[PDB]
Amino acid sequence: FGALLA
Amino acid sequence: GIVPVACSDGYGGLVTTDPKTADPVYGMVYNPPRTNYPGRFTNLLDVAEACPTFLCFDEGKPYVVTRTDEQRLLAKFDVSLAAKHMSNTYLSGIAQYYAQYSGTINLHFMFTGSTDSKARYMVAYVPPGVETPPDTPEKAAHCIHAEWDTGLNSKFTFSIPYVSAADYAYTASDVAETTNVQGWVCIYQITHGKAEQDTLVVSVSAGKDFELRLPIDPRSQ
Amino acid sequence: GIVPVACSDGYGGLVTTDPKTADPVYGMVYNPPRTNYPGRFTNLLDVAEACPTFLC
Amino acid sequence: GIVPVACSDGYGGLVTTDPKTADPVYGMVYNPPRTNYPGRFTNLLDVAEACPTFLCFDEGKPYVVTRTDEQRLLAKFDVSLAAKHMSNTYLSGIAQYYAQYSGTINLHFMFTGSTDSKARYMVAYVPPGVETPPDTPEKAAHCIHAEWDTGLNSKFTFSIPYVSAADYAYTASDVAETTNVQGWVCIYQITHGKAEQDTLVVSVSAGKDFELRLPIDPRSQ
Amino acid sequence: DRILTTRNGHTTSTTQSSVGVTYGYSTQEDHVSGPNTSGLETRVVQAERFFKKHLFDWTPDKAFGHLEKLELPTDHKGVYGCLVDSFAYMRNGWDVEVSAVGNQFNGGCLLVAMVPEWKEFTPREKYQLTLFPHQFISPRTNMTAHIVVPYLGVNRYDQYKKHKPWTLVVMVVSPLTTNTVSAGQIKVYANIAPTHVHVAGELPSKE
Amino acid sequence: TTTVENYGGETQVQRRQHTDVTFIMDRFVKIQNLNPTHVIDLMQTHQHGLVGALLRAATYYFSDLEIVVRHDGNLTWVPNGAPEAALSNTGNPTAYLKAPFTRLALPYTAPHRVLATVYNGTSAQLPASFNFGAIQATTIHELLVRMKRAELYCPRPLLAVEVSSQDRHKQKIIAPAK
Amino acid sequence: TTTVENYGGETQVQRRQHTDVTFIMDRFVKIQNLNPTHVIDLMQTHQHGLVGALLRAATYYFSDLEIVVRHDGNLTWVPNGAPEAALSNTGNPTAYLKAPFTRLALPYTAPHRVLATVYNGTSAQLPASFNFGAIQATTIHELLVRMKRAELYCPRPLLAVEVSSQDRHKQKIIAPAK
């Protein structure tokens, strides 16, 4: 859910 | 023969700002590459426009508050880069090295209250020409002003317009000046609901068309 | 070597009407526009020819 | 009239390194041809890279030896062009006239023992950051190192890598420097077989990327 | 929507109270390989992961200007820490996340910033800390600040035992306010992770 | 960024030439603490001077230099990292006395890619390698430094004089006589 | 030639401009032992001076010259092989006193294809023909020589100061004050 900063 | 010349009187002296370049004495020096070094700035105003700094209020506070919930003037300050309220800003730090300016100056307001606190503020630009600043929103309403709520967006921005007779204005303020030359900015609290201990943080940055000209070295050295 | 020159006697002095221009020291100054400012005169005689004045 | 000029203050003085050339006074001198004169060098580093010179050990010896056949540190020296062990090298002789350097430095090892003597050595680069140099091969093994045998090829070469924070390093060493800034080089004898009186001659030359910059005249004159 | 999940190595942080990620000065890293390392540098990904540290307890008594700092890197008892003792030179960026958990009824504001070459700031200079990569934390808006900065400094590689380029700074902009419904105090924690970790001069064993 | 258009105004054209970093730093400034043997360190400029303060308003910088020196005897310059003893020999760039003073162009010679105005650690004080070399002469009366091709990185606080008047800092501005 | 590639390293790019023979020798150096009548001999440079030592680090050399002379009265130069008595006549290149000193360009005038810094035999001392001529004036206060278009052949030893400290030769390196 939402944004990812992998 | 050789070339005849006339050594002209009044020329040749060293001028701390002349465009001449000296003669090199140590050549062929290659310096480590600086390509892609982070954080470079090429113009002071690029920084001044992107990084608002805090205004200075009552007791060195970058914010204003209020206990009563009636209409009241929260703060009033001179529209001068030499104003006390601006003394700790980056904009004023930069401006002190220039004799003149012109353009927009941006004020940023940030509400730090809890979710259960709401407030309605008003900011107005009072041009020069009046003896004393308006003490109430009613009187100030006739001036260029903006009013706003504190909801999901706790931040608000207002532009102080450049409005003077001349195309430029001085950055410094002369001792002769009784009433500020560029007018005042007034921040009122129309009213609030349970926001007695909550504050409004104010900061300032340069506007898109803000401009400084004529560099000077004024500080006492 | 370098360029040989002869500093000539009698030249170089300041003359209140010489055509020389001094060296600039403060650059890049842009001045407010003056285009279309009313009442400009470029020659004294233009004025003298269009505005008679009273004899005494 | 004639050309007006401004004799500028601060210019014109003689500078021992200026690029100006004087005015000739005796012309048309033809000199005997020098085409094809043997042994010309155009760059000091070409020579420094092709002619290793001897390091200076214990008693002005360009070599190290050992009586015991156990693991032992044969020699340890500062990775500095001002190191005592380098004091008699051509590289240091050249380096003294430059403020900074960077690049590879090559160490050459030559075994002078008889055919009946065999030995196994190890050389390691100990970067700055440790209080004292490793006294045993075991400890030094974790550093950049090389180990080798003495057989038909009695010569071995090892490159001391340039590893520092800055892109350049000083050639001189300041009195403030307690522990060497560029680390140490350690030469160990892993073990040997009947090589008690046999020696290992060590020399140094410049690496392919060794570089010196910023000439100086430091010697007391 | 407003829910951010950051992942560094085998560690993740899912923040629901996020404003976004602020990248300081640049989004790219100056070539990790330069002439000062003679191509002997390597990357140690096993060290690029989160580690925690408590900064301070934000209370109503702390007024404007109260400043807390954490110079990076700090003592690390993990893989990263091992690197610091095994190599002479290192370089790395920082993925920083700071959280001040209270409740929507607390008021007040905190300034979270990453400062290059820390120096003790004077009361007056504090009004300009926004000149540095920062983000604000205000209970009504967010409980988590998130900043990402690259490596920098006069030298391409550093010796962290002698110099610490980046310094995390948290300052009270507006004091914490409390209701009968709010929290009494807010504990500020930091979730930090080194980035693009490179080592260079391998040292000997201390035994 | 907000503009006056929000309430019917019109944003004008701006000429930021004078706030250009390279331009503003490009001028001569004094260095007050002098000695017969002096190491050129830009941090020796006055902290409130036009250039001194702007320089300190940045973390990292780079620039070549141009200097003016009024001295007695001959002037000798030595690059960054050179032994102090070298200043005594003519092999190094030496300028022979020519009134009223000597003006030279010096290149950046530090071993670092850039220098800093503040350094958090040990080499308080800044590392010794943060210099543009040293100059020496029998006597050095005055020294003017000029930053050529300046580059500034990572801005830091810059302060105006603090105000006590509680409203505006007033001071005598130039005006005609009579 | 070995490189750091042997153990995983990477050889970098090098700029050898400063170790170029022509460039390095191209600068003014002093000559200390002076007389009203002086024969220009490059071996009169200091043995440890930047140029003096580098010159001695070569067996054979060639170069034109440029000199600076601070003198009283007029300066007269005479070519290699000229009778000493000739220095008294104006027919030879003579420079009339002009403060603060005289700077001239002189050509190599030796009868040999090249000169030497060491000579094993008789013409210890070097042959008398190893000179760039002679100069004369009422009084010669200072003399600076400069090797133009220098060429060096057959390198010889070049030594650094010897070390006693048994580890490193340490000396005061320039650094900021305060």
Residue numbers in the entry:
A (entry chain D): 80 to 85
B (entry chain C), D (entry chain C): 1 to 221
C (entry chain C): 1 to 56
E (entry chain B): 12 to 218
F (entry chain A), G (entry chain A): 12 to 134, 156 to 210
Q: From the publication, what sentences describe this entry?
A:
FMDV is a non-enveloped single-stranded RNA virus belonging to the family Picornaviridae. During assembly a 95 kDa polyprotein (P1) is cleaved by the viral 3C protease to yield VP0 (36 kDa), VP1 (32 kDa) and VP3 (27 kDa) which self-assemble to form the capsid. The structural proteins are arranged in an icosahedral lattice of 12 pentameric building blocks which are the major structural intermediates for FMDV assembly and disassembly.
Here we have rationally engineered a disulfide bond by mutating a single histidine residue at position 93 of VP2 located at the icosahedral 2-fold axis between adjacent pentamers. In situ room temperature X-ray crystallography was used to determine the structure of both wild-type and mutant capsids produced using vaccinia virus at 2.2 Å and 2.9 Å resolution respectively. The crystals were essentially isomorphous to those obtained for both A22 virus and A22 natural empty particles, and refinement, using strict 15-fold non-crystallographic symmetry and real space averaging gave reliable maps and models for both structures. However, one region on the surface of the particle showed a significant structural difference: residues 171–181 of the VP3 GH loop adopt essentially identical folds in the two natural particles, whereas in wt and H2093C recombinant particles their structure is more extended and almost identical to that seen in another serotype A virus, A10. Recent work on EV71 has demonstrated that maintaining the proper positions of the 2-fold helices (which harbour the H2093C mutation in FMDV) is essential for maintaining native antigenicity, suggesting that the approach we have demonstrated here may be applicable across a wide range of human and animal picornaviruses, including polioviruses and coxsackieviruses. One group received A22-wt and the other A22-H2093C capsids. Two of the four animals immunised with wild-type capsids and three of the four immunised with mutated capsids were fully protected using the criteria described in the European pharmacopeia. Baculovirus expressed wild-type and stabilised capsids produced equivalent titres of neutralising antibodies, following a standard immunisation regimen, over a 34 week period post immunisation. Although as yet we do not know if forming a disulphide bridge will be possible for all serotypes, especially in the baculovirus expression system, our results demonstrate that capsid stability can be augmented without compromising immunogenicity and this might be a general tactic for improving vaccine efficacy.
